[PDB]
């Protein structure tokens, strides 16, 4: 019947890293539109990481059921921009199972939507569909801003993520992306880092304090790789024009905006900048023009843009399923009410279906489908959620509270970890 069992749920929750399949879609938060016949490619290229040993297990099941029912267990993917006049494009192809990037996506001006997202659809080479997964939303822009209003898309808040790229003399082929690989920064033509950009608070350290707020030119900034947590030293972000760094006592009035060109100066030496030489990241010393301006080269000039991420996790706990794994439910929040036997929870999120049941740890609970953004259930009593088998997993050893992860489970056995934990110290 393929219904999830408690024993199987317990094995999964204790061992997520060898079962759970992760699909992470990364992309910029804005795209410049194309007029006429032109194609202005999305940069950095939207990409997809398939993460987890679960992917290899999934291939194994597809391999072992290929011979009951060789390279028809190979991944095939497509991506498009949700438009019925836009071509779907074929995607390229540690715990990284596989990686693909879409390098030639664009949106024409004939497409009148203010926002769009990308739908990546995955298949096995034999025709078997895995499913369609959407990105976060992307705002269409006409061109980079030259202001001296919606800040959520145009400005860069401390704590958010950005991609940084180098391009020489308007040449697509020359594009290189700041990226960390092997515990060092470098520049790649296929991969790009999403870096957290922080306003430094106040000779340097591994531990530093940060500030909220928008990043302005002339701001001291810490860039931190979101994947490895490695950082660059403190850098002051500077506006650039045409191989010159503009140091004017007036650009500090200007907030850094999407698709602006900038330079990063070392805090110790005002003449030294972060610079790219043949995919190698270096310190390069500028030549002083005057007090308002420094001479650099196109190697020290970076375009900055805000990036986003859509992540989905699933496990086919009761064996390979006949239907697509998608639509993958997403849980944005839990809203709990009442105390004791009165206590209930509303799940808020997106892409719910009536074929889902909420599990508090390894305990399934009767679930009301209200809409695709609302599920409702009762909170099961502590005594039935934590027992002599599960005590070790659901007990906070510092405070003694009972904490259980919330999963959404489909009736054919696909478990979707929500990312959320229910604590009985609520209530």
């Amino acid at each position: 019947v393929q219904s999830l069992t408690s024993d199987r749920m317990i094995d999964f929750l204790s061992n997520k890293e060898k079962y759970e399949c992760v699909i992470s879609i990364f992309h910029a938060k804005v795209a410049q539109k194309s007029y006429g016949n032109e194609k202005r490619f999305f940069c950095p290229p939207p990409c997809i990481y398939l993460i987890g040993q679960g992917w290899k297990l999934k291939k194994d099941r597809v391999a072992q059921l290929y011979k009951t029912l060789q390279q028809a267990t190979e991944l095939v993917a497509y991506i498009g921009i949700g438009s019925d006049t836009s071509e779907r494009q074929q995607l390229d192809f540690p715990n990284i199972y596989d990686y693909c990037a879409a390098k030639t996506l664009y949106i024409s001006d004939s497409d009148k939507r203010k926002y769009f997202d990308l739908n990546a659809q995955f298949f096995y080479g034999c025709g078997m569909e895995i499913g369609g997964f959407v990105s976060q939303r992307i705002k269409v822009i006409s061109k980079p801003s030259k202001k001296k209003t919606d800040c959520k898309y145009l400005c860069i808040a401390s704590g958010t993520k950005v991609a940084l790229f180098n391009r020489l003399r308007s040449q697509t082929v020359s594009t290189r992306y700041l990226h960390v690989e092997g515990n060092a920064f470098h520049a790649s033509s296929t991969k790009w880092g999403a870096f957290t950009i922080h306003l430094f608070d106040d000779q340097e350290t591994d531990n530093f304090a940060v500030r909220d707020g928008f990043v302005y030119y002339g701001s001291v900034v810490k860039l931190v790789d979101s994947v490895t947590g490695i950082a660059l030293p403190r850098l002051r972000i500077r506006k650039v024009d045409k191989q010159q760094v503009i140091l004017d006592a007036s650009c500090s009035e200007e907030p850094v905006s999407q698709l602006h060109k900038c330079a990063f100066q070392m805090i110790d030496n005002e003449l030294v900048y972060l610079c790219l030489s043949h995919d190698k990241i270096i310190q390069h010393q500028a030549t002083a023009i005057n007090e308002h301006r420094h001479q650099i080269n196109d190697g020290a000039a970076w375009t900055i843009i805000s990036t986003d991420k859509a992540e989905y996790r699933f496990f086919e706990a009761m064996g390979q399923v006949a239907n697509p794994i998608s639509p993958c439910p997403v849980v944005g929040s839990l809203e709990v009410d009442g105390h004791g036997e009165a206590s209930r929870v509303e799940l808020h999120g997106r892409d719910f279906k009536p074929n889902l049941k909420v599990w508090f740890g390894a305990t399934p609970v009767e679930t009301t489908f209200r809409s695709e953004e609302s599920l409702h259930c009762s909170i099961p009593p502590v005594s039935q959620v934590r027992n002599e088998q599960t005590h070790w997993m659901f007990t906070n050893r510092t405070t003694g509270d009972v904490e259980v992860p919330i999963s959404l489970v489909r009736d054919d056995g696909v478990v979707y970890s929500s990312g959320l934990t229910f604590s009985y110290k609520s209530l």
Binding site: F208, V210, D212, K222, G229, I282, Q283
Partner: peptide, 15 residues
């Protein structure tokens, strides 16, 4: 005002 911990990678000097 948060604290962050991140080991630093130093860009090698040019020559």
């Amino acid at each position: 005002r948060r604290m962050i911990n991140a080991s630093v990678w130093m860009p090698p000097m040019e020559n």
